[PDB]
Amino acid sequence: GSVTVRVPGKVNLYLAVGDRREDGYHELTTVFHAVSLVDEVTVRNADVLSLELVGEGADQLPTDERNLAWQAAELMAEHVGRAPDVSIMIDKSIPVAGGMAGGSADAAAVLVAMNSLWELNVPRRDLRMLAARLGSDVPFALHGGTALGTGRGEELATVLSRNTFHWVLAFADSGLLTSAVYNELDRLREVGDPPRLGEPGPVLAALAAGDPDQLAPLLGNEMQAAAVSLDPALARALRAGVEAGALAGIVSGSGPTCAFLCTSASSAIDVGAQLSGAGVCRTVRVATGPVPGARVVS
Numbered sequence: 261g262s263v264t265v266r267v268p269g270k271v272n273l274y275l276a277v278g279d280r281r282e283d284g285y286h287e288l289t290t291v292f293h294a295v296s297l298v299d300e301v302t303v304r305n306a307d308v309l310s311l312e313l314v315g316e317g318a319d320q321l322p323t324d325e326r327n328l329a330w331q332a333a334e335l336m337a338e339h340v341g342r343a344p345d346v347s348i349m350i351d352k353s354i355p356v357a358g359g360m361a362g363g364s365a366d367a368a369a370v371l372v373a374m375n376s377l378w379e380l381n382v383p384r385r386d387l388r389m390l391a392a393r394l395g396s397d398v399p400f401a402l403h404g405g406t407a408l409g410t411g412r413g414e415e416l417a418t419v420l421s422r423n424t425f426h427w428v429l430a431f432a433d434s435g436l437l438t439s440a441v442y443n444e445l446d447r448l449r450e451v452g453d454p455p456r457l458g459e460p461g462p463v464l465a466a467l468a469a470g471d472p473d474q475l476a477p478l479l480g481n482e483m484q485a486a487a488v489s490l491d492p493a494l495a496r497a498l499r500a501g502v503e504a505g506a507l508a509g510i511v512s513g514s515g516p517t518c519a520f521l522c523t524s525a526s527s528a529i530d531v532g533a534q535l536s537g538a539g540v541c542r543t544v545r546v547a548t549g550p551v552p553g554a555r556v557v558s
């Protein structure tokens with residue numbers, strides 16, 4: 261028998277980055293938002309641990325220990341004292357090297373799929389502890405929906421929305437090195453005052469009300485000035501999406517991926533068509549959010 265689990269990629273609707281300290285850590289507060297670009301991960305009992313990926317960028321990815329999904333299987337098996345005697349087949353649609361944390365998504369899917377394949381139901385709290393050891397975006401991939409996160413090792417606070425939101429997401433081909441982005445954020449903070457965000461209250465309120473008009477100008481990312489300084493083309497890409505009809509655009513996380521909020525599914529399609537036509541991006545996709553975290557779909 262087989263289990264398959266669907267797990268979404270994410271965007272950051274809000275990201276505050278604390279001042280650097282030692283050894284060079286920045287505390288983060290973030291509103292993670294899972295969207296309907298998803299991987300499907302299928303796990304079977306097998307003689308030995310194995311991993312295969314298929315889908316658009318599947319060719320780029322390690323299929324051994326370097327793959328987070330491979331570590332997830334190891335950790336999950338070890339937690340219940342078992343050998344990771346499973347084979348894992350990942351059907352990938354979350355854009356690879358996209359900033360949407362697809363590898364973290366797959367890791368969380370493997371935890372859930374093994375839980376179910378082995379008929380164990382280790383408790384959610386144990387799966388979240390394993391997520392935390394795996395890496396900083398695995399917990400949100402298990403959690404999904406929308407959640408406010410407040411540092412690592414801290415829980416995620418669930419945030420419910422009255423309505424679905426409609427997104428156009430735009431991808432460069434090269435990303436940006438997250439270390440480059442932090443260094444430049446530190447620099448911009450030594451030499452000036454780049455955008456500083458208020459606290460996430462207003463963002464959460466707009467989110468709870470299901471109201472894209474209220475949410476749009478509250479979207480924000482303290483990493484965005486650094487990313488646009490390293491990658492001046494992002495600024496034009498952001499203007500272009502809004503010119504095409506989006507309510508707002510921001511860079512998601514460390515960038516360079518750009519998230520544009522639209523009023524509706526129709527409008528997102530129009531915006532996407534125009535941005536795709538304007539060649540400011542390598543790839544343009546539409547998506548909705550929030551969607552659920554890792555869950556069995558077989």
Ligand SMILES: Nc1ncnc2c1ncn2[C@@H]1O[C@H](COP(=O)(O)OP(=O)(O)O)[C@@H](O)[C@H]1O
Binds near residue numbers: 328354355
């Ligand atoms: N501590 C870490 N250092 C570097 N990469 C990490 C770490 N933890 C998780 N990851 C990343 O999670 C990624 C998921 O990949 P993918 O979503 O395709 O692109 P993105 O990582 O830009 O969101 C893996 O490629 C891996 O690089």
